Amino acid sequence: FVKVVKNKAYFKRYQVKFRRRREGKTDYYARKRLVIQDKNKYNTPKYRMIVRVTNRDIICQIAYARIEGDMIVCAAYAHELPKYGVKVGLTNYAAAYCTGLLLARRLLNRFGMDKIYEGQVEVTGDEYNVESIDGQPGAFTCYLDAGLARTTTGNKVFGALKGAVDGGLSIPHSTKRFPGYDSESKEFNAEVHRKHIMGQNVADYMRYLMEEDEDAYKKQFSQYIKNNVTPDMMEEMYKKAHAAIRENPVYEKKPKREVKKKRWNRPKMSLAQKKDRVAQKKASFLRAQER
Amino acid sequence: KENPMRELRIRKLCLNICVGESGDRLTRAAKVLEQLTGQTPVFSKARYTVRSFGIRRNEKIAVHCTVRGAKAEEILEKGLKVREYELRKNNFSDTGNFGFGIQEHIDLGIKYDPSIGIYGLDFYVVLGRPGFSIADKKRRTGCIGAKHRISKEEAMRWFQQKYDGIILPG
Amino acid sequence: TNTKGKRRGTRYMFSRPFRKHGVVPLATYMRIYKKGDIVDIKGMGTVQKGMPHKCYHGKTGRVYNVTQHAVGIVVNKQVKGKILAKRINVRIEHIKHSKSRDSFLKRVKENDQKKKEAKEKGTWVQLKRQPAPPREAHFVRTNGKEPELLEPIPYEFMA
Amino acid sequence: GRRPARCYRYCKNKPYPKSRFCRGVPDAKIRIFDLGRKKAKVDEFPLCGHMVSDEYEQLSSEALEAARICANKYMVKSCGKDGFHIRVRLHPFHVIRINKMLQTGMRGAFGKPQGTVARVHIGQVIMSIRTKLQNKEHVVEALRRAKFKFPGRQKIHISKKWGFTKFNADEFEDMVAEKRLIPDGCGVKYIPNRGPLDKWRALHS
Amino acid sequence: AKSKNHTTHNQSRKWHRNGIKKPRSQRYESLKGVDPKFLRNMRFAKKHNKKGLKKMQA
RNA sequence: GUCUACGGCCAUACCACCCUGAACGCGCCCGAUCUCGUCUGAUCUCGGAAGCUAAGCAGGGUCGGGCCUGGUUAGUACUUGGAUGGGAGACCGCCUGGGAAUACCGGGUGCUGUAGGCUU
RNA sequence: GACAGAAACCUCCCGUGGAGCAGAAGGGCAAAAGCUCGCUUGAUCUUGAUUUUCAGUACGAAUACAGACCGUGAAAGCGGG
RNA sequence: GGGGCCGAAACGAUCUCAACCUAUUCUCAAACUUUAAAUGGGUAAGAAGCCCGGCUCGCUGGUGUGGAGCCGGGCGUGGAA
Ligand SMILES: [Mg+2]
Ligand SMILES: [Mg+2]
Ligand SMILES: [Mg+2]
Ligand SMILES: [Mg+2]
Ligand SMILES: [Mg+2]
Ligand SMILES: [Mg+2]
Ligand SMILES: [Mg+2]
Ligand SMILES: [Mg+2]
Ligand SMILES: [Mg+2]
Ligand SMILES: [Mg+2]
Ligand SMILES: [Mg+2]
């Protein structure tokens, strides 16, 4: 026949991966090259901005590594943008920029450095990077953490990076992966990037689609219709969201609810129960053989 | 009730011509399947050197394409027109994919051209079910489970129920 | 004669333990080393950079210089009839803290607290470690049962 | 044209098997280790007799061959053609060397492979005879006769195990009756209480 | 005229006759081999200790 | 009770098969105008929200394999130091201290950190 | 799965490395140290310290830095064969 | 795959002999190994140690952060044989 490959020797010589690698979550190569602090820095924290794009929202965190685990000093989720005025479209480039701005502003406010480092108050899309002013405390510096995301031009992780840079974080970057960089001739214009930041590509798609056919338009934009946002409000709505974020970044935690203590899973069966189970099965089989 | 997420669909259809040599005939075969599908084919080289076969390593000796969706169904039903919806039971893989081969391509309705010639095709259709992108996506790769797989007999039943074809034993 | 090679005879020394190959865990990199810390050296075959010589494997030294990816440490090496305290530069993956100094630190801080306290009380406290003493006199109760007898068993050629 | 065994009768050098390093070894003279009616079940040959070594020495494949031939011949003459089973439980894996002369001397004296021997510890079994319960004196006589082909000292011991198994003869039949042991040819298979119970019900029905 | 090749017979006695002495230890160890950047800054700190003198005495 | 993002220790976490999943989530899923990339929007990138627990995923189960930890094997094997001990030798016994590994028989089958939800 | 075959090419599944990494062997390695692409010349300039053989001499080889000038990547970083 | 038989043939069937696969079984390895001793090799068992306060830095820094070096003071039951 065929020599079975997964046998006792195979299993007892098998060597498992790390748990996160087995789940497929993280890349330990870049993990080690990114989070390990230089030894003569002597316990100085090293800061990542972890950016994750989900099927329905955007997660941004600031974290530094410790032996027991990673510490997260601040975090901004995209599903709290309606509180600031973005009703729909929570997983696009504009939403990523907004959540990066919210993360940066909340972190600066928590550190007490928000009056300093206003950043790009009025967005323009071109290259910008904050410089530390003398006498005042230095600018907060972190490094991007994209994870397994493929870092190609026009990525929402770079959208969030631009948002936080405008917020006032001193992150090292180049304007090569921003949308607006042309590959063939190697230039970067700020107007295309600003269109993407304002979501004007989405507005143009809405206009195009509603011009040609309305069945596909109602299919593909439906919550947009329910929250009755027209392609014309996009820019002013995003500007209002930016202003609201920059004027109030502090977070309000949801109140802790009282617990009724209902168990939804099944508790682990005990040794006596399973031994009685096997005895019962044996007895039932013997009885069936008897009849 | 059958869950809608368990509807058999053809994931893709792979077409190839292995011509056995390199050059003008290979280019003409490339034009053949480009006309057949509508997309540029890709040339497959040789991994070794087999003297009795007349091929050296790294020599382009095959052409292939893959097609997905509407074009896949159209090409598949054209091939089943060619072989009158008649398949032998051995043509089915234990995974559920299947395939066949045609000796000559003008049976597909494409006009003959004197400067092109005659070529045979290998069709191979691989089926699927909503949720098979799990095994190949990047961010969190996993298996597909035992219930959700595809079986040989139910691949046959799907073929004979939607293409109303006939499966001859042997 | 033998060869003067640098990794001669390290076949089982620099290999990884069973079912512990692969990627090195990050706590080893994340641990920090001040100067003056007592450190155990143990070479690892996964990393070929900054790898100590086979004569310092299993040895213990003292950190004196800390750099970006490695530490400089001072270890005692015995040559023919003299001992040399000499410097090596070892990358972090081949390095651990030693708990021998930690035991002493715990014991000394505990003696310090027990000396500052119980001093105003005026009582005398033993602070040194006397070795294990001979056992003291005690009674063994054979409550009820009599000690059951043992006898050697006869030989049987079970071979 | 081999030397007397008093040369190579001691376990002096390290074990030295035939491998990718030591090539050119001639074949061992002994190559049949099981003989008699080896196609016999476990339930009709309950008596087992061992020839157990007493000294820590080396035995040559020639001696093993001669001893098995003598024992087989006597058993065939005595208990009939197929009323027994002989198993030699030593395989010659040590290869010994000869530094053959003829005037170089001791310069570069590392010998070539000459033959093979088996290294034997104290109490280790050399031969085993499995047969019916009423041929005990025939077995002991055959082993006593085979004793004369070996150097050193050997002992003959009738074992308490059932045939060529690791289970005692006083309780083998009890276990096989209550379905702890499954006969599967010359040996027996042991059934624990740990697998899936599908095997349990298959065995009990 | 072959002769003896290698030996460490009387060597332990020779060594322990004058004894295996632990290496000499002093309270201050030399600053050779340390990081040049670290040493440069430490020498700057030593050089500018003087300018904070009066505050310390007060 | 439980999940998400980032993790620490890296099978008590793996593997095979079966059962169950309330809410949020995580996903499968719907499309290709824009950014982007392919022979192929399959992957990657982008824009969504009609449907779905089918799968991934979480929990549970198997007189489950494996793994972890005990008993036995066993004071056995081996070993520090000693004798004007035995023995033709091969090797062996004792004194002084130390002391294993299979087979076989049991038990267990992830804990945990930071931040953020659900259980109105 | 046409010719097609023991062995050409295509597709799916299993696959802890049972392959490969110039050569001898040993070690090491799986979103890599292997395979395929893109860009390049850290195989460059300079002063010291240290390890290996060792007499703690030399050469050769190697290791941590430091100062320039660069390459690469979005970046952390990595690179003076 | 082979020796055949009924079979024009028939994975239709018969024995087979084989190779294959699955559980077992006898014996091994200086250049094999999951395990794994005894004897053995480092280090520590304080006054150069602990505990406070204050200055310098061109290094490191969200943060007089970190680290290093200096000053001044307090602790003797000399912390196993
Ligand atoms: Mg990467
Ligand atoms: Mg010898
Ligand atoms: Mg001499
Ligand atoms: Mg799609
Ligand atoms: Mg599910
Ligand atoms: Mg389900
Ligand atoms: Mg089990
Ligand atoms: Mg948790
Ligand atoms: Mg309710
Ligand atoms: Mg790589
Ligand atoms: Mg440099």
Out of C67, C81, C87, name the one closest to residue E20 (CB): C81
What is the interface size between C and D, counted as CB pairs within 8 Å?
Answer: 6
What approach was used to elucidate this structure? cryo-EM
Q: Strand B86-88 relative to strand B166-168: parallel, antiparallel, unpaired?
A: parallel
Out of A17, A29, A39, name the one closest to residue C67 (CB): A39
- Chain D closest CA to A287's CA: distance in Å? 12
Q: Is A144 helix (H, G, I), strand (E, B) or coil?
A: strand
Which of these, A44, A57, A61, A24, lies nearest to A146 by C-alpha position?
A61
Q: CA C45 → C1' G20, Å?
A: 19
Which of these, A249, A230, A232, A242, lies nearest to A95 by C-alpha position?
A242
Distance of CA A141 to the CA centre of its chain: 19
What protein residues have CB closer than 5 angstroms to ion ligand 1? Answer: A 30
User: How close is the Cα of A152 to the center of ligand 8, in Å?
Assistant: 32
User: Would you say B64 and B77 are in contact if contact means Cβ atoms under 8 Å apart?
Assistant: no
> Would an 8 Å CB–CB cutoff place B47 in contact with chain A?
no
- Residues 155-214/A with CB within 7 Å of nucleic chain F are 155-156, 179, 181-183, 201-202, 204-205, 208
User: Would you say D162 and D155 are in contact if contact means Cβ atoms under 8 Å apart?
Assistant: no
Radius of gyration of chain E, Cα coordinates, nearest whole angstrom: 26
Question: For helices A190-198 and A156-167, what crossing angle results, to 10°?
Answer: 100
Residues of A with Cβ-Cβ distance to B141 under 8 angstroms? 24
Query: In the 3-class helix/strand/coil scheme, how is chain D assigned residue by residue?
Result: CCCCCCCCCCCCCCCCCCCCCCCCCCCCCCCCCEEECCCCCCCCCCEEEEEEECCCEEEEHHHHHHHHHHHHHHHHHHHCCCCEEEEECCCCCEEEEECCCCCCCCCCCCCEEEEEEEEECCCCEEEEEEECCCCHHHHHHHHHHHHHHCCCCEEEEECCECCCCCCEHHHHHHHHHCCCEEECCCCEEECCCCCCHHHHHHHHC
Give dist(CA B123, CA B13) in Å, integer.
Answer: 7
Q: Is B12 helix (H, G, I), strand (E, B) or coil?
A: strand
Ligand that lies nearest to the alpha carbon of residue B133, given by its number in the listed order: 4
Give dist(CA A236, CA A218) in Å, integer.
Answer: 23
- Chain D closest CA to A286's CA: distance in Å? 9
Which of these, C119, C132, C70, C126, lies nearest to C95 by C-alpha position?
C70
Residues of D with Cβ-Cβ distance to A278 under 8 angstroms? 197
H or E stretch including A63?
Answer: strand A58-65
Residue with tokens 């076969």: B53
Ligand that lies nearest to the alpha carbon of residue D10, given by its number in the listed order: 2
Give dist(CA A178, CA A148) in Å, integer.
Answer: 18
Phi, psi of C87 (to 5 degrees): -95, 135
Which of these, A155, A176, A142, lies nearest to A61 by C-alpha position?
A142
> What's the distance, Cα to Cα, between the start and end of chain A in Å?
39
Which of these, D58, D55, D60, lies nearest to D2 by C-alpha position?
D60
> Would an 8 Å CB–CB cutoff place A288 in contact with chain D?
no
H or E stretch including C24?
Answer: none
Which structure tokens are listed for A206? 């809405």
Which residue type does A258 have? E
B99 touches strand G (CB under 7 A): yes
Q: CA A148 → C1' F58, Å?
A: 23
H or E stretch including C136?
Answer: none
Residue C82, beta-bridge partner list: C79
User: Would you say C86 and C77 are in contact if contact means Cβ atoms under 8 Å apart?
Assistant: yes
Which of these, C89, C99, C93, lies nearest to C16 by C-alpha position?
C93
User: How close is the Cα of A97 to the center of ligand 4, in Å?
Assistant: 25
Out of E11, E22, E29, name the one closest to residue C64 (CB): E29
Which structure tokens are listed for A53? 């794009």
Which of these, A128, A181, A130, lies nearest to A155 by C-alpha position?
A181
Q: Which residue of C has its CA nearest to E6?
A: C1
Q: Which residue of A has its CA nearest to C69?
A: A39
Q: Is B14 helix (H, G, I), strand (E, B) or coil?
A: strand
Phi, psi of D95 (to 5 degrees): -115, 130
Which of these, A207, A180, A189, A196, lies nearest to A235 by C-alpha position?
A196
The residues, any chain, with a CB within 8 Å of residue D99's CB and separated by 6 or more, are: D109, D110, D111
User: Would you say A47 and A60 are in contact if contact means Cβ atoms under 8 Å apart?
Assistant: no
- Chain A closest CA to B136's CA: distance in Å? 12
Which residue type does D76 have? V
User: How close is the Cα of A30 to the center of ligand 1, in Å?
Assistant: 6
> What's the distance, Cα to Cα, between the start and end of chain B in Å?
35
Question: For helices D61-79 and D136-146, what crossing angle results, to 10°?
Answer: 150
Which of these, C96, C94, C97, lies nearest to C16 by C-alpha position?
C94
H or E stretch including A183?
Answer: none
Binary contact (A40, C68; C-beta < 8 A): yes
Q: Which residue of C has its CA nearest to A14?
A: C19
